[PDB]
Write a protein that binds this ligand. Structure first.
Ligand SMILES: CC(C)N(C[C@H]1O[C@@H](n2cnc3c(N)ncnc32)[C@H](O)[C@@H]1O)[C@H]1C[C@@H](CCc2nc3cc(C(C)(C)C)ccc3[nH]2)C1
Length: 320
């Protein structure tokens, strides 16, 4: 049918690619997706690499189908070879694995390229976040008991990313507007599709329609251990409304944001006991060197009512 097919490394349904090979944006074509996909699978399987590298030269002219099929076939043949070896005394790769950071960037990238049909329909109302978000996840030091929500989910790329790098129960995304929430519906599928295509595990997640300020979410925000929220352009109305939901939150949970929900040099005194800063720490996170008003940093808030307790331990016994 004048097309290309890649064979899944765990005998899942192959990836179909129509010719000519679609270009998605100024820096992303499906041609390189392929090349990437291949060398990423070569990564999981040292054997496939062994069967490929010692023969392949990696590079081909992407303009020619006669040259792209040349590679795909080579790859597809190497796959069968390994699958045969999978019938021998040797074990296959462990199926219950999470993606390595490197791999996952590529995966989410595919999910974007394939689901975002019109890369302009949202980018008009919106203004690599991956590397950034990755940093935050190491900073969050997430434990198997936490719950995560992205407030204002968008198409939920982060929702997905957290779901693959951490290890917890149903993680959630909340999106009000129909457009990005609609894209999220197919973003759900492709992600789950490609994950199976690669044979990698991901925590349960759910990309939802709704407003986070609404009555129902008041409750849920309080139950959620980890909160990512990009609040750069939020405006005082909504900013205050969040602080109240964050108030109810359990002890020790975290909030990551572009803008601080509590001042940085916050000392507790007379006319500030009502303020949210009383129940949380706010340490500043330094930005990754390759990501973009140039001067920007980030803020990690941790629920700490010992901050408060100390002030009420101090009103008893003035040492000065
Ligand atoms: C500016 C943020 C909040 N957001 C805008 C979206 O918020 C949505 N939104 C507005 N108010 C809404 C409402 N009350 N309920 C439902 N959703 C609403 C709105 O529809 C819009 O699509 C965009 C971020 C993008 C989602 C992916 C994402 N990038 C993140 C970056 C970060 C950093 C800054 C800490 C690194 C953290 C989390 C991220 N998630 C969508």
């Amino acid at each position: 049918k004048l097309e290309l097919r890649l064979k899944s490394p765990v005998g899942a349904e192959p990836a179909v690619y129509p010719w000519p090979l679609p270009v998605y944006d100024k820096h992303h074509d499906a041609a390189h997706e392929i090349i990437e996909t291949i060398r990423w699978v070569c990564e999981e399987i040292p054997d496939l690499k062994l069967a490929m590298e010692n023969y392949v030269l990696i590079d081909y002219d992407t303009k020619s189908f006669e040259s792209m099929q040349r590679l795909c076939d080579k790859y597809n043949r190497a796959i069968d070879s390994i699958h045969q070896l999978w019938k021998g005394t040797t074990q296959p790769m462990k199926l219950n694995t999470r993606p390595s950071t490197g791999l996952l960037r590529h995966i989410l990238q595919q999910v974007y390229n394939h689901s975002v049909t019109d890369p302009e329909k949202l980018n008009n109302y919106e203004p690599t976040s991956f590397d950034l978000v990755a940093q935050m996840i190491d900073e969050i030091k997430m434990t198997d008991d936490d719950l995560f929500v992205d407030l204002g989910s968008g198409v939920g790329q982060v929702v997905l990313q957290v779901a693959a790098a951490t290890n917890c129960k149903h993680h959630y995304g909340v999106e009000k507007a129909d457009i990005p929430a609609k894209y999220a519906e197919t973003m759900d599928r492709e992600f789950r599709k490609w994950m199976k295509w690669y044979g990698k595990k991901h925590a349960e997640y759910t990309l939802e329609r709704g407003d986070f300020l609404s009555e129902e979410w008041r409750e849920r925000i309080a139950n959620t251990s980890v909160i990512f929220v990009n609040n750069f352009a939020f405006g005082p109305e909504v900013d205050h409304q969040l602080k109240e939901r964050f108030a109810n939150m359990k002890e020790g949970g975290r909030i990551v944001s572009s803008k601080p929900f509590a001042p940085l040099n916050f000392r507790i005194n007379s006319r500030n006991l009502s303020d949210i800063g009383t129940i949380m720490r706010v340490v500043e996170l330094s930005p990754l060197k390759g990501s973009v008003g140039k001067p920007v940093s980030y803020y990690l808030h941790t629920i700490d009512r010992t901050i408060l307790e100390n002030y009420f331990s101090s009103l008893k016994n003035p040492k000065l």
